[PDB]
Amino acid sequence: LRERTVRLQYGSRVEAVYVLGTYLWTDVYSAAPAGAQTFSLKHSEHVWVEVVRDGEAEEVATNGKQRWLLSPSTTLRVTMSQASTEASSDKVTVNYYDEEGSIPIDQAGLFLTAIEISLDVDADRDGVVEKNNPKKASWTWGPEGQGAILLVNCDRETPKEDCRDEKVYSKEALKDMSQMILRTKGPDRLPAGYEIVLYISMSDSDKVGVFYVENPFFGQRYIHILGRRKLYHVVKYTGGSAELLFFVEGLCFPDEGFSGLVSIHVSLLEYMAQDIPLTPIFTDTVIFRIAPWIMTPNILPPVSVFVCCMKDNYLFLKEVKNLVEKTNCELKVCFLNRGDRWIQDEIEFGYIEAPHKGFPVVLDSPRDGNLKDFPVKELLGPDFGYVTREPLFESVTSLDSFGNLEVSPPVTVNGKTYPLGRILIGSSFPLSGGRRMTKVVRDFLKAQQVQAPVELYSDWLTVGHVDEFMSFVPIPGTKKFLLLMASTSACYKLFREKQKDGHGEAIMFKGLGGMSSKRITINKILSNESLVQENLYFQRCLDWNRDILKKELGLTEQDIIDLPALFKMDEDHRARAFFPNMVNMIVLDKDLGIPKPFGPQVEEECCLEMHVRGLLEPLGLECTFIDDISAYHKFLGEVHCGTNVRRKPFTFKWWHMVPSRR
Amino acid sequence: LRERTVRLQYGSRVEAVYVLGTYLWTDVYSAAPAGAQTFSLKHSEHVWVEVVRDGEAEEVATNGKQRWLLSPSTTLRVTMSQASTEASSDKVTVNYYDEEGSIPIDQAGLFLTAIEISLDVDADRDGVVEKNNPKKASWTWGPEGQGAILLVNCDRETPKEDCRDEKVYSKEALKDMSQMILRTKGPDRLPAGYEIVLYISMSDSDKVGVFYVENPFFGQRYIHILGRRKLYHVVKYTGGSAELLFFVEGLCFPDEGFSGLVSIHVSLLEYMAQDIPLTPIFTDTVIFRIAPWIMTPNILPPVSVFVCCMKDNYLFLKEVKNLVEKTNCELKVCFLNRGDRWIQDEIEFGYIEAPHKGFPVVLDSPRDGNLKDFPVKELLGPDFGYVTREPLFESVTSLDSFGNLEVSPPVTVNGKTYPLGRILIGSSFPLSGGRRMTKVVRDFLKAQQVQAPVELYSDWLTVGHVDEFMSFVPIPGTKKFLLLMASTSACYKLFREKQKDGHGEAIMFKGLGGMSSKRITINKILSNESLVQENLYFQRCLDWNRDILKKELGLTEQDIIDLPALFKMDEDHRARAFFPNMVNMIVLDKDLGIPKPFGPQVEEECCLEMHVRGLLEPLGLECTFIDDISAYHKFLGEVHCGTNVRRKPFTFKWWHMVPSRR
Ligand SMILES: [Ca+2]
Ligand SMILES: [Ca+2]
Ligand SMILES: [Ca+2]
Ligand SMILES: [Ca+2]
Ligand SMILES: [Ca+2]
Ligand SMILES: [Ca+2]
Ligand SMILES: [Ca+2]
Ligand SMILES: [Ca+2]
Ligand SMILES: [Ca+2]
Ligand SMILES: [Ca+2]
């Protein structure tokens, strides 16, 4: 399909390599002796030759005596369909004649060696490397889209991430890598003056690495041939039909300034002379897209439940164990220097996938320098990946914690489907001068593209995390889900009812000895005027979020349930929980671990517990209240335990999505 | 279409601004007294009220006596279709009842002021600002695409570019600017606690500026309200139906890291209390795309012919004048410190366009520090723009000159149309370690996107410019064009013919006295063996380019004519012209100014001139040979004159293109 110029040379024979999949146009006029009138040609059996006059092509016999007028506009088109062997003589010979006489006055010739060269990848995304996919040089989204996929190699095979260096050790490691095969066919050797070279751009050199596995005498060997500080590698040619197998790894996720696309080239180079660069004769290119980091909403099947707490919080552990035992999930428990909530706050479970393989990958929250410096690498291991983003000049705040990072179930909004859901992060109003998650992390999340992030307003909360006020739960037995929203108005309605009912003296925080002297009742709560005003204002903040969520997630009031909540304002005019926030809950399918609220007791049951059950249970959701605060004897608005659930990936393949143009 | 949450408040009246184009969902349950069973409602004539039970909505009369059960899932939907006036009382009142008795036990109410707020731009690209285009918040390419366009204001109204500062002076200046109108409708004033604010992001603040024109007592006044170091502006509200007219300017072209898209917002803000940020109640957004810098191929109608030479090169000036007099073009002549070719090398004429206006814009080549430091601003003026890109850490080379920057005619390649043609720039092979145009300039050209740049191989030439070896010409009387390629093989064929004909002693450079002692003939040229080998190699370089051009421009051999050329190799193994390169020519439609070659004289005519005429004239192209070298008495491979043609823009609108996803 590609036409290449090869001219005959005046008086001299021309030798050239012909690469299958191309064809030659050949000027015979320049090589004609002065005074020459006509020309004739001969060619071998495996070379097809057409005489082309002003676009009109005529195929010519191997030995014709046919003669044509010499003209600038009369040329040859030369095609070969099969590679040369050692038995080949592939040639075209042109004879020139003058006016008088039929014996040639000169001859010019073209001697050819045909070879096949193809750099192949699995562009059709079935896990196997197909021969020369015509689409391998581009990358397109969607069910009909094409082009190869590369995984960041962020995990660790042998006890930093595998991609932090240029070395490969074990065979298992190669499984994380995408295969790329250089397929060639030809005679025993390349003709003099040619070589085959693999290469990448300087820019891509920190995005990829390429290894070749050789099996020498003493064992299998993995050579790093392209990557950081290696931009090119000269390939050893072997004749006949040969394949060279390479393994490719990504070193970097998509990010600000990096689309995720990288390229690898192979060229056939021709030696000209000393001090003169080699001419690329033929170049073949493949494109990879590096797979994005993807999060998991609460609707996806749970795999493992991770929790952190102090060794002596017994009730919490017994109750979490009890909950998980109702499911098929496994429980993992940890008791680190600091960060009581760290499992929830310092890490987010996500995954990467390619047609041939995938695995969970953990994102690590930025280090402030006050509490967190040490990264959490304790979870870095085989087929568990690690990644992080550290701000250069920007200060870290509470909004950088991953309690502030969540993701919605799959949604359709204005007719646009988001099959992986949408990432949600808390922020402050634009003109507010308030807190915001660091740009480096926001940029990262935006760059993954397939979760199309949305900013909510969390800055009205002292801690500032979206998970304080909202969560999602599946509706059992269906494909649907609900948004759960904290509501102060719901709490006040409930307490006002219980007061009307004669329960005004009902006490909260029963069993927390450090709260006893405060003697906090429903009456005491309802009679506090400033607290009412604080909570009206917090309800306005919640409702502003409700409106953003309904708009950006395509939700109606039918999709939302309000859970009673209550806050107290701090000196910064931000909210901290008055009693534990029930909305932040462990969701394992139909089973919900719900923080125990310690609300007013009516007839020896917590009226907050009974109210939540009455909302959820009719939907087939099973509620277990989990007490994380008793071991501390009081609740000041902070929770000292954390949980994070690792989930199965979406069955929808990310590469089948079609994100909006950026 | 947008639903907003507004709750009734327990015991107290709620006052709210309602923005047309939204509607409210209203919880009446929270505000109900404890023990209340049912509710009823009244509403004014301009407020529509529906009672919504589990998604089922029923419209309700202005005064009904109807009563409904109080439930969390029974709410109101409140709609208004027209703005409030001073005669309006727009309200909804809800009465609550207990079990026993029909007299209300309490009342909660909602008092509304409806206003219209719309930030409007010409998104449909007709030059007029339409009312609230539903597509104004996005930007799409193509004939069906939508969203507003902004021009970089790079020219200068009053004798640096207008965008270099925050000031506006004259009314003519506003014509370069896109109009944006804030349209409002409402009562005499906003209710207490509200204000309207225009704003942009910190990131966009160096991409745009926004002015308001006020007409105070002593004259018209232009206030810069958004831009560098102003991120927001509080708008003065006026009642009734009002429009505020703003003018928007772009400060920056698309580039590496900047897509060309910017946003402007207006919000209605609500005051909460001291130390508490204002709540955006409603926000409306418009998007602008900044128009790309676009070049002009030789096929476009010429407007002005710019030339630079020394005052005494008389023949050049007479001959260029003669040529231009055959056309409708105007001639502009300049005689600067240095850069004899500067008009060709230091500047490129291009243009920008928006639906309401456009104008030529000059790009200025990077300063090296050896020859060029001073930018060329002499051409900066009204409706002639200026732009430049300076490398930070990168060294400038000859490939940064704009002799190395050209553009193809409109082409179709593999079925993909490039209606504006494709930009061409010379480079070196990837593995060569050779010269390349600076990244900053390459990045700029790539960022414009609509000319989809292609790199050719110019580094085999000492000067290193694509315009040394190739050019395009229209085919008169048709819509087609030809690629012209320098060819050494064509030159050797021609000289070998003339030698055979008995002309071997024909002398070149006739009339250049400084060349006389060299006595260079056809025989002398043909007998130089090393020169033959040099030129075979240069023909290989030309042919490598021929192949790239045919592939990337979708050209066949029918589209190409070869012009005889000859080079001499320098100590770096690069080519310099042996006789003037004829391919670099002034193209004014059918009339071609061609550098006079000073070739061997046969029968008192230059055989190179006669040969070129024989190729071109049959196509209806008229050739004028222009002598730029006689004033210098010799030709060493450098030309001391320059020309650049300013052309009419393409009739195809750039915004009707659909570029590939990046
Ligand atoms: Ca495949
Ligand atoms: Ca490694
Ligand atoms: Ca690995
Ligand atoms: Ca692995
Ligand atoms: Ca999280
Ligand atoms: Ca319009
Ligand atoms: Ca200005
Ligand atoms: Ca201007
Ligand atoms: Ca102007
Ligand atoms: Ca140019």
Structural domains in chain B plus CATH codes:
1-120 (2.60.40.1860), 121-290 (2.60.40.1700), 291-662 (3.75.10.10)
User: What is the nearest CA distance from B62 to chain A, expressed in angstroms?
Assistant: 25
Q: How many CA atoms, within 13 angstroms, populate the side-chain half-sphere of residue B523?
A: 8
Rounded distance, CA A573 to CA B290, Å? 41
Cα angle: B353, vertex B357, B361; to 5 degrees: 50
Identify how the structure was determined. Answer: X-ray
- Tell me the residue type at A264: I
B265 Cα to the center of ligand 8, angstroms? 24
Rounded distance, CA A452 to CA A424, Å? 9
Looking at all shown ligands, the one closest to residue B468's CA atom is: 10
Listed in sequence order, the residues at least 6 apart from A115 whose beta carbon sits closer than 8 Å to its beta carbon are: A17, A18, A19, A20, A83, A84, A184, A185, A186, A187, A190, A268
Name residue, tokens 């001391």.
B640
Residues bordering ligand 3, an ion, CB closer than 5 Å:
A 153, 155, 162, 173, 176
**B441 and B400 Cβ atoms separated by less than 8 Å:** yes
Cα angle: A101, vertex A102, A108; to 5 degrees: 115
Listed in sequence order, the residues at least 6 apart from A482 whose beta carbon sits closer than 8 Å to its beta carbon are: A472, A473, A475, A559, A560, A561, A619
Rounded distance, CA B628 to CA B327, Å? 20
> Phi/psi class of residue A452: alpha, beta or left (left: φ > 0; alpha: ψ in -120 to 50)?
left
Rounded distance, CA B46 to CA B18, Å? 12
Active site residues of B: 641
Residues of chain B in contact with residue A278, where contact means CB-CB under 8 angstroms, are: 429, 431-432
**B482 and B558 Cβ atoms separated by less than 8 Å:** no
Report the candidate in B385, B359, B383, B364 with the shortest Cα–Cα distance to residue B161: B385
Residues of chain A in contact with residue B197, where contact means CB-CB under 8 angstroms, are: 431
The residue annotated as part of the active site, out of A154, A308, A541, A641, is: A641
| Exposed / middle / buried, residue A335 (Cβ in 10 Å: 0-12, 13-18, 19+) | exposed
Listed in sequence order, the residues at least 6 apart from A236 whose beta carbon sits closer than 8 Å to its beta carbon are: none
Query: Could you tell me where the beta strands, DSSP code E, fall in A121-200?
Result: 148-150, 178-186, 194-199
Helix (H, G, I), strand (E, B) or coil at A196: strand
A227 Cα to the center of ligand 4, angstroms? 19
Preferred mutation among B279, B449, B488, B541 to probe A, highest tally of A CBs within 10 A: B279
A499 DSSP assignment: I
Task: For CA atoms B584, B588, B591, B593, give the dihedral sign.
Answer: negative
Helix (H, G, I), strand (E, B) or coil at A173: helix
Read off φ and ψ for residue B340, nearest 5 degrees. Answer: -50, -35
| Residue A403, token pair as written in the block | 């309690």
Query: Could you tell me where the beta strands, DSSP code E, fall in A435-490?
Result: 454-457, 470-474, 481-487
CB contact under 8 A, A279 and B544: yes
User: What is the nearest CA distance from A170 to chain B, expressed in angstroms?
Assistant: 32
**B352 and B292 Cβ atoms separated by less than 8 Å:** yes
Name residue, tokens 């800055």.
A459
Q: Judging by DSSP bridges, how do beta strands A74-79 and A68-69 pair with one another? A: unpaired
CB contact under 8 A, A562 and B72: yes
Helix (H, G, I), strand (E, B) or coil at A378: coil
Residues of chain A in contact with residue B612, where contact means CB-CB under 8 angstroms, are: none
Residues of chain A in contact with residue B279, where contact means CB-CB under 8 angstroms, are: 429, 540, 544
In angstroms, this model's resolution equals 1.9
**B597 and B579 Cβ atoms separated by less than 8 Å:** yes
E strand or H helix at B553:
helix B529-553
User: What is the nearest CA distance from B490 to chain A, expressed in angstroms?
Assistant: 7
Q: Sheet containing A330-334: which strands, arranged edge to edge?
A: A330-334, A302-308, A642-647
CB contact under 8 A, B573 and A5: no
Rounded distance, CA B483 to CA B559, Å? 6
Rounded distance, CA B114 to CA B110, Å? 12
Helix (H, G, I), strand (E, B) or coil at A567: strand
Rounded distance, CA B255 to CA B440, Å? 9
Listed in sequence order, the residues at least 6 apart from B441 whose beta carbon sits closer than 8 Å to its beta carbon are: B366, B389, B391, B400
Tell me how crowded residue A378 is: count the other CB atoms within 10 A of its CB: 11
Residues of chain B in contact with residue A27, where contact means CB-CB under 8 angstroms, are: 489
CB contact under 8 A, B493 and A432: no
Listed in sequence order, the residues at least 6 apart from A409 whose beta carbon sits closer than 8 Å to its beta carbon are: A297, A298, A299, A421, A472, A474, A481
Report the candidate in A619, A616, A610 with the shortest Cα–Cα distance to residue A497: A610
CB contact under 8 A, B201 and A430: yes
| Residue B594, token pair as written in the block | 């061609």
Listed in sequence order, the residues at least 6 apart from B529 whose beta carbon sits closer than 8 Å to its beta carbon are: none
Read off φ and ψ for residue B532, nearest 5 degrees. Answer: -60, -50
Rounded distance, CA A174 to CA A177, Å? 5
Task: For CA atoms A553, A555, A560, A562, give the dihedral sign.
Answer: positive
Helix (H, G, I), strand (E, B) or coil at B107: strand
Rounded distance, CA A535 to CA A495, Å? 14
Listed in sequence order, the residues at least 6 apart from B240 whose beta carbon sits closer than 8 Å to its beta carbon are: B185, B186, B188
A161 Cα to the center of ligand 2, angstroms? 7
E strand or H helix at A542:
helix A529-553
Q: How many CA atoms, within 13 angstroms, populate the side-chain half-sphere of residue A25?
A: 22
Rounded distance, CA B429 to CA A277, Å? 8
**B386 and B379 Cβ atoms separated by less than 8 Å:** yes
Report the candidate in A402, A546, A552 with the shortest Cα–Cα distance to residue A464: A402
Report the candidate in B213, B212, B214 with the shortest Cα–Cα distance to residue B227: B212
Listed in sequence order, the residues at least 6 apart from A416 whose beta carbon sits closer than 8 Å to its beta carbon are: A660
The dihedral over CA atoms of B550, B554, B557, B562, expressed in degrees to the nearest 10, equals -50
A33 DSSP assignment: P
First to last CA, chain A: 33
- Tell me the residue type at B614: G
CB contact under 8 A, A496 and B257: no
Q: For residue A589, list its beta bridge partners.
A: none
Name residue, tokens 């087929």.
A383
Query: Could you tell me where the beta strands, DSSP code E, fall in B20-79?
Result: 22-26, 38-43, 48-53, 56-59, 68-69, 74-79
Rounded distance, CA A134 to CA A285, Å? 11
Query: Could you tell me where the beta strands, DSSP code E, fall in B154-193?
Result: 178-186
| Exposed / middle / buried, residue B619 (Cβ in 10 Å: 0-12, 13-18, 19+) | middle
Give the residue before each break in chain B, using a C-to-N cut-off of over 2.5 angstroms; say none if it is continuous: 159, 335
Q: How far is CA B46 from CA B111, B382, B586, in A?
A: 12, 53, 71
- Tell me the residue type at A173: A
Radius of gyration of chain A (CA): 35
Largest CA distance in chain B: 128
Q: How far is CA A281 from CA A3, A240, B321, B635, in A?
A: 12, 21, 45, 35
User: What is the nearest CA distance from B434 to chain A, expressed in angstroms?
Assistant: 9
Partner residue facing A661 (CB), from B432, B539, B661: B661
Tell me how crowded residue B315 is: count the other CB atoms within 10 A of its CB: 14
Helix (H, G, I), strand (E, B) or coil at B201: coil
Q: How far is CA B500 from CA A32, B488, B503, in A?
A: 13, 18, 7
Q: For residue B561, list its beta bridge partners.
A: B484
| Exposed / middle / buried, residue B497 (Cβ in 10 Å: 0-12, 13-18, 19+) | middle
Size of interface A-B (CB pairs under 8 A): 144
**B245 and B213 Cβ atoms separated by less than 8 Å:** yes
CB contact under 8 A, A500 and B35: yes
Residues of chain A in contact with residue B536, where contact means CB-CB under 8 angstroms, are: 9
- Tell me the residue type at A111: F
CB contact under 8 A, A34 and B279: no
E strand or H helix at B343:
helix B342-345
B210 Cα to the center of ligand 8, angstroms? 13
Cα angle: A352, vertex A354, A356; to 5 degrees: 130
| Residue A471, token pair as written in the block | 């969560």
Report the candidate in A76, A78, A23, A8 with the shortest Cα–Cα distance to residue A282: A23
